[PDB]
Amino acid sequence: TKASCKLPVKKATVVYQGERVKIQEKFKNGMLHGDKVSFFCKNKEKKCSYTEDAQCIDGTIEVPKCFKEHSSLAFWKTDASDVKPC
Secondary structure (H helix, E strand, C coil): CCCCCCCCCCCCCCEEECEEEEEEHHHHCCCCCCCCEEEEEEEEEEEEEEHHHEEECCEEEEECCCCCCCCCCCCCCCCCHCCCCC
């Protein structure tokens, strides 16, 4: 069987097939099973951002740790989802 997943967040921006979209909208009803999506993150040793491809499973998924649900304290720092790739 292939049970879809479940949008772990309400504002996650990933890159499906080379496309930036908000899992909270493109996957309003969870994500397809096996659906692969990359999460935008930032690099300190490189000073740039990149994507962390991911994989969906039967109503289950392992979001990339580097990701960040929301992390309060929004100070001078653009979210990897809005940074330029190294």
